[PDB]
Nucleic acid binder design. Sequence first.
RNA 1: GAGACUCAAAUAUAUUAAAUAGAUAUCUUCAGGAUUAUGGUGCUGAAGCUUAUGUAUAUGUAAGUGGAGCCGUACCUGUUGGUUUGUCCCAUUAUAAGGACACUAGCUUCUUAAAUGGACAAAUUGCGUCUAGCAAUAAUGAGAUUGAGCAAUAACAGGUCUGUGAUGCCCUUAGAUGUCCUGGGCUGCACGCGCGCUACAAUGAAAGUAUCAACGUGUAUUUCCUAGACCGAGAGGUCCGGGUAAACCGCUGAACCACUUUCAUGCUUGGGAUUGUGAACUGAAACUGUUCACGAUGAACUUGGAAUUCCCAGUAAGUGUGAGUCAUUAACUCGCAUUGAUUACGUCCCUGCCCUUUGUACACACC
Lengths: 137, 190, 74, 102, 62, 66, 82, 74, 154
Amino acid sequence: PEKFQHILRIMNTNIDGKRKVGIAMTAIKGVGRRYSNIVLKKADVDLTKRAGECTEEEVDKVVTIISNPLQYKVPNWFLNRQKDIIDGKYWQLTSSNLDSKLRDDLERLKKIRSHRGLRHYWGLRVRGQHTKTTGRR
Amino acid sequence: PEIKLFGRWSCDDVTVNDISLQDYISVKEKFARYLPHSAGRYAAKRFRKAQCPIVERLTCSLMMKGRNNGKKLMACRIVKHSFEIIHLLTGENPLQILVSAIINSGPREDSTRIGRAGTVRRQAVDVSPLRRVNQAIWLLCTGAREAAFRNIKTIAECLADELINAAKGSSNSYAIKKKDELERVAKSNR
Amino acid sequence: SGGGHVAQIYAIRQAISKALVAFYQKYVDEASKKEIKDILVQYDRTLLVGDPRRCEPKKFGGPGARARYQKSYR
Amino acid sequence: SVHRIRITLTSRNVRSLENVCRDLINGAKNQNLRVKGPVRMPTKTLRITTRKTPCGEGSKTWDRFQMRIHKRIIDLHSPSEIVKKITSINIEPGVEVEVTIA
Amino acid sequence: PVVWARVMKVLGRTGSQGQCTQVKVEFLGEQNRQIIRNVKGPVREGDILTLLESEREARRLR
Amino acid sequence: MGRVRTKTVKKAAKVIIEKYYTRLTLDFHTNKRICEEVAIIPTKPLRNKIAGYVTHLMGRLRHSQV
Amino acid sequence: TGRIELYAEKVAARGLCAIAQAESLRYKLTGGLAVRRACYGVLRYIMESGAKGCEVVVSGKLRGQRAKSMKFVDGLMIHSGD
Amino acid sequence: RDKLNNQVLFDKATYEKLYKEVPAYKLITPSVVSERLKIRGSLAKRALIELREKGLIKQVVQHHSQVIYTRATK
Amino acid sequence: MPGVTVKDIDQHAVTKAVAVFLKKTGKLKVPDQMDIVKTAKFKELAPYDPDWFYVRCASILRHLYHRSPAGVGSITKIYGGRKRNGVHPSHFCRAADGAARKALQALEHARLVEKHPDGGRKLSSIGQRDLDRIANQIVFKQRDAAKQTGPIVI
RNA sequence: GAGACUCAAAUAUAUUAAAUAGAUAUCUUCAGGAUUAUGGUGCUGAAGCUUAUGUAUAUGUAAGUGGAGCCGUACCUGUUGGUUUGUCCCAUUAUAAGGACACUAGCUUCUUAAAUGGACAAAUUGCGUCUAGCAAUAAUGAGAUUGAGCAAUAACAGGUCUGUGAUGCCCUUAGAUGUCCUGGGCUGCACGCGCGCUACAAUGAAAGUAUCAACGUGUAUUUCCUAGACCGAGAGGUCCGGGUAAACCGCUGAACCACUUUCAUGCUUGGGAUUGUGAACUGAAACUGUUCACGAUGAACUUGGAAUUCCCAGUAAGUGUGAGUCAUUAACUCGCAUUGAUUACGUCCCUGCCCUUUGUACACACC
């Protein structure tokens, strides 16, 4: 029943509310498709529904499971980062923090003059996948 | 005790309302199958496709474009549902309406690219009737494709829209437009 | 036992239709046989006929039995 | 003493196998051991697939290799002499003979 | 006014691509006259052919 | 569909007809059984073919001298 | 020891073998060996042994740089079929 | 690029509108109900289940991928 | 006619109805995550129709008895086709081993199955008893709907 | 040479057997249902449910709750064991066996392979020199039956010295170009190509659920296929059992597919690139990467120009599987089943090639 909310903002990302909840969340860096099976269902959201539907209350509940997943029965193995290295906390990285730590992990290896490092630096592919035919555009 | 019905549909009183198209539109003049599914060895002889019910032809022909290929079990339910929609839009027997839909679309002439020594002019050639029924069935299926593809609209709905649009020839239909162009080229060439 | 969803189930239709005719050989009559045979052969769907059409052997230079790969150019 | 004995025979060539089995069954049946005779087992088609080319380079012709091994079982119920005679003759061309106590 | 015509004889194949079949039709409405039109695909004896244009007869370029 | 039967089939068929004509009928099944008895044809598909080409030759012989 | 024993046996009517005749050609050849004596000679010998056909192929450069082939056939030789 | 990303949620003004609109739509089906803007594929399927409650819809067809009903006939 | 559901094995009316009866008696023990569980390496996403555990445990129940012992390695092969191995290839890859399996453990605690010699599971004490009992009641339910249909005509 | 031939794919168990696969009938066993019929307890209180306790969640007992069914059998449907001349009384540890009975209380329609018979374009009729043949029809499992294998004379400076310890000559050979040990390349990317794989959707994807296989293959001086039990989302970890295999994994009950939902054409829930991450596995050792899941990041692609490959029936196309290579490594390759077309049943037009006809001063032959 009813209308509204279309274009809802969760941590520093614009979310098109016109897409069914899980699928909408893919505009959030960190919150693609497959955790809406974790997050919404354990947050007790009615799952046949829109992201443009459902109370701010449910939005807050969803945010807490995302950032604190271990405490809601979410296995360690279902978290983006097991065993970080640094602080070695089981963490699901959200939003812009994903981007920042992505840079930080490149930078660890760039400093040292690592293989991984230097293939980030010049770019190309740090997973050594064949650029004989492909890597281009 | 013998005889009777397609899916629940009366085979009897289904008139092919066009001589020449009688018998190459092989409805079920004795052939009361029940299902549009058949083991269907129609390919060995040239004239053995003349035998196979037009409903069965429609099922065979729906499932082309490679992902979709050879799912005859997909095909038969869609033609059965297209029947049922056809019965609701115009009212009567949906077998009669399929037969009428194939009739309207059937192409008068055509052109072949005879080599003519620098500037290749075409020579115009009349159509054989063992291509009229098949090409009708095929372009009703292409019209059903095109409308249903990016549309919300179900294949069964777009088949039934295409078929009824053909049956009382509102023209409109993709089938008629493409064919009429081939005929116009045939009218010129001579 | 065997083959597939349509293949098996198609084969049951043959099995029953053929079977009934046999009962009439030994016990009832050809009267019952012939009337049945006429009905079966006429509308057909190979009900009395053991289908020969079986999987042609796949051919060297093809993943498919006549269907070759490649691009010889010309 | 009756000892129940099962002889298994494995070997390749069609016609030779038939004649070895035939003699053993007939001699057994003649001297009424009453047998339960020739268990004709499915022939195992052993398939190797290779390119006709040593050194790959010509328009992909494949030569593939098949071998058929034919297995056949005969059951005898007898002791001392009859067991050892009937096993040791029919022997000579390409037959592997296995005798099992039961 | 479409007049229908019945395949009397299948005469031959004409074409550089050999698609076309030549066919004699004696017309169903008033028999006694026989016209050759060339038919596109495959024809067999007493197939029926729809004459859009009752007469005008093509023939053959070898 | 295609084909006329090769020289080994046809030659065999001409030679048997000359000698055996009396005892060769328009009927195939008897022509099959005469051929194995009178002639050592090693294999059954070849025997049937020879005997069968005799059946064909006999059919035309009846329809005014061949 | 004594779990395997080898026994010598004659090859049936010697001349037919092809392998016996092939060995004969190598010993003749290394002794030297004129050709029409040899090729037609082996061909003649096995045909004499009542063999239906025979083909001897020499593919080889005899004294002149380039490899030459000749097939010497007297026979009904199938080559083909089962 | 013809956008058209319509409206999820019953929107009770449209739900009333839907009821009145449905006859002469003799093709009346979750896609036609969509076509007349306020596209729901599958909550229009529930809108049909709601019509099936008695009044309007003559269900000849109940099918996955083709869900065909009717106006309440002449 | 008397009875006839099938006897061991699914089919379509039976599986949904047996599943529903399992929902009613609620003692199944749904391994905490299963909202999250793709069921699969082969299947992109987790149950859009969230209630898959109940229908799965019904599916395996009826499956098991006909085979005699149909445990864990077997159940992955039948159930759950067809894997998008990312960019390459389109394939058949075995289902999530534990996802099907834990429902078998669930049914053992639900006591709808007894331990077999030479078998993990032969249901022929109480597992079969409940299954074919609800199965016959399901045909009677279909019959009851037909008995109701009789008067209407519409 | 082609062919004929042989093999495989099609038909009779009529003929030979059978640890499989099975008609189905008997005996035996377990389960449910009342549709129908009958008997047994029951408003004098039945089934069911709950709690406590004792004993090993189950059972018994006590109490409460409950309010008309509950149980057995014939019958029907399903399960299990023996039942391919069986069973019993006797033998043997268990068959045959001996005597009795069913005197057939399981045969082979169906697997597999031994052997036969089955197609000859048979019958007829159009067509044709009324020839060889062709076309059509009916009968048939198949209408010259469908597909391979096999292959000549003669030709090529085709490819291969990196299969070969077959091989000429030369080189190399105490500083190896042999070989081994350690480490790296083959796996590097402005860029041209070729095979593919995967897509662009909605005849669909997402998600439940219906569920049907085959060809091959598997541990002997070994560490293979692994059923079944537990933990794990998954990879895997962990203990047992079967199988050197008509026996067991395995009817490889595989995928596409069936059915019902969710979604609505929006680079979208299509698509799955890249990415930092990420638990193990194989190995002595895993960094332009050995491989792999989950968790994540979430690209082009919105049907591809000139060109060009392949294809006429279980063929095409979709779709999976098994085998090989192999410690690890499949988008490969070879077979196999499955779902199963649209369309020619024409012709030499394009292309390629042979054959006649011609010219030739060519003949180590138009490189």
